[PDB]
């Protein structure tokens, strides 16, 4: 009953938040890389230009 | 309800109300007992799903009983424990002043002894009902015990 | 009746015909006592102990 209920909550709770959670920081990296590697790109093109 | 909170959000969880009706061997049992407490039709009722148990004629056989579940789902199981007031009360309710029940499983067991006591009257009744809930698997038996009290 | 310094615990056996897993109409209630030391946990009966 009551106690299993809680924490069949307190479970869904956490796994709900770090997928989310996960979920973020996956995204939040690619860009970054995306980001980094173009910069670089636009860095070494500063680099010859200037 | 001891532990109200659990029973109400395991039915809540289950979604569905349906019932079935079952002959069991009650016997030598003064049963369909009324109470002017519950009004049904303008008059003396109980409880609809329930029965409660009544002596015949001075006298209470303890009621051994089972129940097979031979079928492919969960049967959900609801009975009470009546709280008798006085000695006086108990004699004429269950003529036996020891009250005692056991319910089982193959699984699990409970049981629980009557407090006879002088409770405070809502609606005017000094007594009350105590509920469990035994939940039964497929292949195993029910099984009631008694000597009284029994919802 | 058990107990220790700190906690105590008492139960009282319950005569009934339970149904017969294996044959038997009868069952054993579990319980576990924590000791701490210099405690000296003591075990009243009557019987029906294990
Ligand atoms: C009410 O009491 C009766 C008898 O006092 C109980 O009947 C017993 O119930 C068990 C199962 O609950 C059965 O045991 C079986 O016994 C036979 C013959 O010894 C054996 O071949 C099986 O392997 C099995 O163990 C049996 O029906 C019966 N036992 C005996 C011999 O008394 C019963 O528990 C209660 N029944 C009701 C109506 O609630
Ligand atoms: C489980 O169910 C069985 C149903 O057969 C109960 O067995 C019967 O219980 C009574 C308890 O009072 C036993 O004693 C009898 O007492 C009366 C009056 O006090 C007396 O007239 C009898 O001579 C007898 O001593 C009785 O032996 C027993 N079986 C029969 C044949 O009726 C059992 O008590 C139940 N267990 C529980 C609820 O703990
Ligand atoms: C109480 O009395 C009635 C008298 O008709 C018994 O019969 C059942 O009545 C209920 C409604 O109270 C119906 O739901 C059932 O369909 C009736 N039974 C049958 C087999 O048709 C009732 O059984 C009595 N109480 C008992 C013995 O527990």
């Excluded at chain 1, 670089?40 to 230009?49: A, G």
């Excluded at chain 2, 609809?48 to 089972?66: D, I």
């Excluded at chain 2, 709280?83 to 002043?97: G, R």
């Amino acid at each position: 009953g009551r106690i299993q209920d809680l924490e069949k909550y307190v479970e869904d709770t956490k796994i709900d938040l770090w997928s989310y959670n996960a979920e973020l920081l996956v995204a939040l990296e690619n860009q970054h890389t995306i980001d980094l590697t173009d910069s670089e790109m636009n860095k070494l093109f500063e680099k010859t230009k200037k | 309800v001891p532990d109200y909170a659990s029973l109400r959000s395991l039915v809540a969880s289950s979604g569905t109300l349906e019932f079935n009706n079952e002959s069991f061997n009650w016997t030598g049992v003064t049963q369909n007992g009324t109470s002017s407490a519950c009004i049904r039709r303008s008059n003396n009722s109980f409880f609809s799903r329930l029965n409660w148990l009544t002596q015949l004629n001075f006298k209470y056989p303890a009621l051994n009983v089972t129940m097979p579940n031979n079928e492919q789902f969960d049967k959900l199981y609801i009975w009470g424990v009546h709280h008798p007031v006085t000695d006086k009360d108990q004699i004429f309710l269950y003529a036996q002043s020891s009250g005692r029940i056991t319910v089982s499983t193959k699984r699990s067991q409970q049981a629980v002894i009557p407090n006879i006591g002088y409770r405070p009257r809502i609606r005017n009744i000094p007594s009350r009902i105590s509920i469990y809930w035994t939940i039964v698997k497929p292949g195993d038996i029910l099984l009631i015990n008694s000597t009284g009290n029994l919802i």
